[PDB]
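Changelog entry: the insect defensin A record was regenerated in this release. Current contents:
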Amino acid sequence: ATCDLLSGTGINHSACAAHCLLRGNRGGYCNGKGVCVCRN
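Regenerated structure tokens:
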């Protein structure tokens, strides 16, 4: 449905999460297409 982790060491979109966190967020996944977006 959305972009999470699925399996412990699967997709691992983490890269985005990190980026977002630095700014000051608590989101960071792949959207519809597969682009890095952040969340609150």
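DSSP finds one helix and two strands in the chain.
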